[PDB]
Amino acid sequence: GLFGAIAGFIEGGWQGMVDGWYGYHHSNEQGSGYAADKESTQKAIDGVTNKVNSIIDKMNTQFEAVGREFNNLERRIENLNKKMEDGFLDVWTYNAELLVLMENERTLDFHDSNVKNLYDKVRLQLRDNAKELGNGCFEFYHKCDNECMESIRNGTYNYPQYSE
Amino acid sequence: GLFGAIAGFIEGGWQGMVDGWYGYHHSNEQGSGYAADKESTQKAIDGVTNKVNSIIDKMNTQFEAVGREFNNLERRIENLNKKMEDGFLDVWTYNAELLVLMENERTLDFHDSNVKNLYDKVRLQLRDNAKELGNGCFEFYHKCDNECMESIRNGTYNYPQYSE
Amino acid sequence: GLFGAIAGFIEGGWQGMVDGWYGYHHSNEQGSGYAADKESTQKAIDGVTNKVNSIIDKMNTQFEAVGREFNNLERRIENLNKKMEDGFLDVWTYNAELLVLMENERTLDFHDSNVKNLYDKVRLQLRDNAKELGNGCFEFYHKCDNECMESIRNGTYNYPQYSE
Amino acid sequence: QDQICIGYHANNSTEQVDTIMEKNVTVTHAQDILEKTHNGKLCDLDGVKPLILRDCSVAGWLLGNPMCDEFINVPEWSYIVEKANPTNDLCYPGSFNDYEELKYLLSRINHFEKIQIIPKSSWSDHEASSGVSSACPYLGSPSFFRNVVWLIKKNSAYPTIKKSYNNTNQEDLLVLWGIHHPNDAAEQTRLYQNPTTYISIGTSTLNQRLVPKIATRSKVNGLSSRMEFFWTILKPNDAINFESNGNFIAPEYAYKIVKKGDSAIMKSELEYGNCNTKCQTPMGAINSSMPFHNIHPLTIGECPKYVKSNRLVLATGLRNS
Amino acid sequence: QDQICIGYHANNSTEQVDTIMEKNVTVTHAQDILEKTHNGKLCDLDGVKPLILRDCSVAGWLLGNPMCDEFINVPEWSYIVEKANPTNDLCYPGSFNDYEELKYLLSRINHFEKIQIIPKSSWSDHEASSGVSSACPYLGSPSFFRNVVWLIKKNSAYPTIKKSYNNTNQEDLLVLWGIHHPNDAAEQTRLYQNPTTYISIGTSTLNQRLVPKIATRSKVNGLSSRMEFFWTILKPNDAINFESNGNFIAPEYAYKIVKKGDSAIMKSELEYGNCNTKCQTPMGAINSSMPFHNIHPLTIGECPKYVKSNRLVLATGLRNS
Amino acid sequence: QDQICIGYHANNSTEQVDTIMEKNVTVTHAQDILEKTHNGKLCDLDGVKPLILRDCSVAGWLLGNPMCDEFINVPEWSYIVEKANPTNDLCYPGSFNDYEELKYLLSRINHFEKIQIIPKSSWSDHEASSGVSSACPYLGSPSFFRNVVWLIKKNSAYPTIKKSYNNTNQEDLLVLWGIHHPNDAAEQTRLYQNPTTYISIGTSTLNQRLVPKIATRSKVNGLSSRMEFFWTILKPNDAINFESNGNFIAPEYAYKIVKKGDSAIMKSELEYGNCNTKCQTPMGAINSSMPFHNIHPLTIGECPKYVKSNRLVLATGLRNS
Ligand SMILES: CC(=O)N[C@H]1[C@H]([C@H](O)[C@H](O)CO)O[C@@](OC[C@H]2O[C@@H](O)[C@H](O)[C@@H](O)[C@H]2O)(C(=O)O)C[C@@H]1O
Ligand SMILES: CC(=O)N[C@H]1[C@H]([C@H](O)[C@H](O)CO)O[C@@](OC[C@H]2O[C@@H](O)[C@H](O)[C@@H](O)[C@H]2O)(C(=O)O)C[C@@H]1O
Ligand SMILES: CC(=O)N[C@H]1[C@H]([C@H](O)[C@H](O)CO)O[C@@](OC[C@H]2O[C@@H](O)[C@H](O)[C@@H](O)[C@H]2O)(C(=O)O)C[C@@H]1O
Ligand SMILES: *[C@@H]1O[C@H](CO)[C@@H](O)[C@H](O)[C@H]1NC(C)=O
Ligand SMILES: *[C@@H]1O[C@H](CO)[C@@H](O)[C@H](O)[C@H]1NC(C)=O
Ligand SMILES: *[C@@H]1O[C@H](CO)[C@@H](O)[C@H](O)[C@H]1NC(C)=O
């Protein structure tokens, strides 16, 4: 983990969250539950969709090999032809594999980035009103009803809510 | 935002700061104001200047196409010539566009990195002496004169300054 | 520094730590000392070893130039031959240099990432039990014996340890 | 008490991808961008059927090797399939000038229309139905290439030939002819009376003089003699002029180029499957939405991009413990 | 009370760039690295003016087509411009041996100096001022290529020629000559008396024997006859030897190669603008500090790098709401 | 009181690397991946020694230039080294057909075995030991190429030759022969009696007729005459047939191709060092574990990857103040 969120301070993944890539898990008075953060899940699906399509669009005009033949006294240009077509098909094989290796990584570190940016979305809201457990969870200094969870889940949480 | 600073917890940009890429905005007893962090603005201008010049220097010996002609009974090598020159000019077009796409990104995430690293420059100095508002701003637990702002603005802030 | 750890809030390096890339430096009742974090030192050595070998494996089938000769009335294909072999050997020189420039950077930012992820390993454990000095160090609100340092050094620190 | 926790997706997929710093990494979701399967058949290309030379070569087809009658008339094709070593080629031993250059032209053509430009019956002062050989048998009897006629003397005489044909079509004409190289001076006179002969050929553009080479050679297909063939493209309204006093292998049928277009000459031992496709390789056709493939570099049609890899998987999802 | 805030720059620029994960992203500052404009002219290159063949081909120039007198003497050039289909080429129909190989040599040369190596007046026993044709008219009268002379018989006689020229210059010599292919045996004797003729040519390196091909061909520019031209580079102190008893098209003027260098043969319908430049493309010159361009791949001079793109913009600044 | 601090490694290394945004950056640990040193020698390749033509060319070797006796018999080689301008080539002036195509074949061969296919003693009706020239001296006396014999007349007579050789070996045969081009008709009869001569050559595949070109040329190595050489690959069980009534330079020794394989023709002024290697360049051998090098692109053996750079350093460690 480059940002350290995924498989770092958060030990693993939540099987129960079949609603998206990033989300939450609360447990207040009115029960537990899961909710997919449709916000960051969208700026992520937008990411890889454009990424896949860009990798494909960057290589639609690549290199086509055409068939040419040569007689017994044209061994030089035949070899030139052979190595020149093998040449381009090698570099494009390199270009494809290398772009995949490089963008698979920037893909994983992108999900790590989003989690790190969601834990910080909540952390930069519940300043004193909670304690950072450090395993990925927070614990409130007040009770948080099912309408309190929603205000955090959409960006505007009210600070006026006492302490200890 | 990969680091989440720009357009993340900081909603937008400060039009009034026509002095550089990164800076501050205070509002104490003696008024408001802006000041360009000439520190991180320099390690950033150094960044993209070298980046532009490196992108250009990496491609000064590219591929030149020269004119060659062939008669009606040299259609094979003519095609070989055609596709071999089209070949190199395709890969170099790929190399240029791909390097731009990849470095435009590492450029944006670089400004995001610097802001994230400036908010942490201040945050790692005004530990208890302020409260992190979370929108990009801090609020002091004491008064901060126009000489107090400068000590933070150049790296050494004095902790002995009481609380609440 | 992209993550800001190395040469950021931590001014420099610890010459005395000849045991690895990342580690600690304590100073309790029973003396000072150094200890290499064999944990993150391993996920780092695994990183660059695979990186070096991948850079090498991505380019084992590159482009070989073979010797071909041409007479005084074959100046066209001779030039074609010349520029086609110069062509591939240019792009592969580009591919090598460019991959090194790009991966040297993702290498430095990788060590910056690991330090940032180790300072956060400790910080997300000693929540109230210490004060973040901000220069890379922490100061305890209790005494920390040579068995207290080890619990932090391997992942499970006990919170029940009073305050001020 | 009360809690709030931030986490991420996970599931049961075992699919792995590679990165620069780490191989074999399992993820939640992925996308394979490499098509690795074909149908092992030679199909029509968008409904237009290929021309599958079977045990005939391009030369055997174009010259009309008697063992190649299957291709006497040939409809529009999409691509041409030739075996690596066609057994029916130059039944009469010899050579074919600028053959690979002709083969290349063929990859630029989609349809020929055979037409009779000089009927075998028009030869009044030479023999035209005795130009046969055991080297080129048809159903057990001595025959010859169908599109050209091997003229010999008549009543102990070979008057010098002056034959001319004007391309009055709107299409280019592929015109083939040949010269015969005997094995000795006796054979020369036996076939042509005249001891010292030539064949001149002219167009707007072509200006050649051929003289036969009477010489001792090693037997091939039973013969020491040779037949050597030539060709040219006759442009509309241009004419071709033949003059010869022996050894002339005159044209009879030629080919109107009625459809130029994108085409190919595939080398494949495969034969006609009964199918249709958008992408054809020499080892089988492809039907895919994949952006890449690894089946064969020489390809025709709207195809994925060829790549030497055996696996290419893009990571869409995230890490999975 | 008291506050401190960390923020970033922003402004009014609408300029956008692309990344892998996102297109059309507005930024504070950017840099376009792609020059997309030329002047639509053919300029001098660093003060040395190009040679613009107008409706003349390289062959028309070098052989001296009468319609090409504009190029009888030609100063040092920087590059050569030829039209796609020059109308003044081989006025007398025929061919030019190793033409593309000569054209390539030309792209390696910057200046020829025409010199008389065999004066037309030196032919005492052959006619030298009757070698003209309606195919090559000058101001309405029958003429011929200026640099070579078409010799014919004199007083019903064509003595065999033995002519020799020694390159006593310090520069390589480009030497052109030709052979004439008549249409019938009557024309052969009418021009040359001798029925069976040849042209031998020798140097250190060259050793050729040419025999004319008397044959029936289709009329081009009114004629069925052909002129076929040859060339060689004569190295300093080497000599060229001609022997012929007919059909010889003798050299008169040749070209000292006085300046080898980097050059080109541009195919362009454009003509001489009146300008100067550091970078010239076939559709116009370039004046730029940009590292790239997208105007034309075939280029000459200190030029940007060609790329097929239509936009290439680098992001220097940062994101802008 | 009590403390805990997180930090990183540092040391004394001054080694620097480059990144995109910054040059000359010092680090703790690095890895240079660019081999920049060779031994400046021409070594054996995995224990098999190269064939170093010294002042002889491939043609001088294969034809048997008397100044090239060092190579009369030549063991299996790994690669071939030829100088840029070998002084011993065609001692008798002339040319060598399809020379570069032969040179290419050579890079595909590792061993020839010289064998006598037509002994000089077998010529009963022609002179075979007078075919010598001052152009090709051996220890001061007139000599000739060793592998071919320059036959001349005998008792004022040159009966037409009919010679045939059948390749009864299991290896391909490289067979060389030539024709002699005299300077005048007197020399022609002086050497061969017959004024009008030819050389026909046939195999399964080859069917050529050569006629000498008697003509005036500039002296090279003292002579105006020329020798022109030809070759072919004779396949097992095929035969080659020569017929000639003059100017024939008959084969005597030919080369069994006993070992096809990967090889090369290096252009290098260097000579035999006394060493062994896995990787050889024309300026010296390489012994390295590096994945890259910058010594020379034309290379042979298990070698690093060639790259035009002068420095390529990978960063393994981290930043170092
Ligand atoms: C038109 C004609 O004359 N066809 C002949 C043919 C030709 O004469 C011959 O090919 C010359 O090119 O000869 C053929 O018989 C050849 C026969 O001759 C024997 O002498 C030889 O030993 C056999 O192997 C065989 O070649 C032929 O069939 O080609 C007969 C044909 O009628
Ligand atoms: C040197 C010379 O004889 N010039 C002649 C030229 C040559 O004789 C001819 O080109 C042979 O190559 O002939 C020209 O007149 C040709 C004229 O002849 C008619 O028969 C024909 O029907 C016309 O179309 C036309 O070709 C010529 O101008 O080239 C005349 C020239 O004087
Ligand atoms: C087989 C034979 O006749 N060898 C001759 C050789 C040939 O006759 C000649 O090369 C023809 O190709 O002639 C040589 O002497 C040549 C000698 O002749 C003078 O006239 C000339 O002025 C000298 O420069 C020189 O060329 C020869 O050595 O090649 C002699 C040889 O015996
Ligand atoms: C072919 O025929 C047309 C029309 O009859 C004629 O005008 C043309 O000149 C002919 N071509 C030749 C080369 O004779
Ligand atoms: C050309 O002239 C020079 C000097 O007169 C002479 O030495 C040289 O041999 C000549 N070249 C030829 C091939 O005759
Ligand atoms: C060469 O010799 C073999 C065996 O004697 C024979 O069968 C073969 O036909 C010969 N080759 C030729 C072309 O004569």
Can you put this structure into words, describing what you see?
- The complex is a heterohexamer, with three copies of chain A (164 residues) and three copies of chain D (321 residues).
- Chain A has one domain (1-164): Hemagglutinin Ectodomain, Chain B (Alpha-Beta Complex), CATH 3.90.20.
- In chain A, a hairpin with a 4-residue loop joins strand 3 (130-132) and strand 4.
- By secondary structure, chain A is of the alpha+beta class.
- Helices cover 46% and strands 12% of the residues of chain A.
- The longest helix of chain A is centred in the middle third of the chain and has 49 residues, at 75-123.
- Chain A contains three helices and four strands.
- In chain A, the strands form two sheets. A two-stranded antiparallel sheet of chain A has the order 1-2. In chain A, strands 3-4 form a two-stranded antiparallel sheet.
- Chain D has helices at 58-63, 99-106, 185-192, and strands spanning 3-8, 16-17, 25-26, 30-32, 34-35, 42-45, 51-52, 80-82, 94-96, 109-116, 133-138, 141-143, 148-150, 161-166, 173-181, 199-202, 207-210, 226-234, 239-244, 248-251, 253-260, 265-267, 272-277, 279-281, 284-286, 292-293, 300-301, 305-306, 313-315.
- Helices cover 7% and strands 38% of the residues of chain D.
- Chain D is mainly beta and 321 residues long.
- Chain D contains three helices and 29 strands.
- In chain D, strands 9, 10, 13, 15, 18, 20 and 21 form a seven-stranded mixed β-sheet that branches. Chain D has a four-stranded antiparallel β-sheet with strand order 14-19-16-17, with no helix packed on it. A three-stranded parallel β-sheet of chain D has the order 5-26-28, with no helix packed on it.
- Chain D has two domains: 1-48 and 271-321, Hemagglutinin Chain A, Domain 2 (Hemagglutinin, Chain A, domain 2), CATH 2.10.77; 49-270, Alpha-Beta Complex (Hemagglutinin (Ha1 Chain), Chain: A, domain 1).
- Chain D is elongated, with a radius of gyration of 29 Å.
- Chain D starts with a strand and ends in a 6-residue tail after the last strand.
- Classes of the chains: A alpha+beta (164), D mainly beta (321).
- Strand 1 (22-28) of chain A pairs antiparallel with strand 1 (3-8) of chain D.
- The complex binds a molecule of 2 linked components (GAL-SIA) (3 copies) and 2-acetamido-2-deoxy-beta-D-glucopyranose (3 copies).
- A molecule of 2 linked components (GAL-SIA) binds next to strand 11 and helix 3 of chain D.
- Chains D, E, F: It is a single-pass type I membrane protein.
- Chains D, E, F: GO terms for molecular function: host cell surface receptor binding.
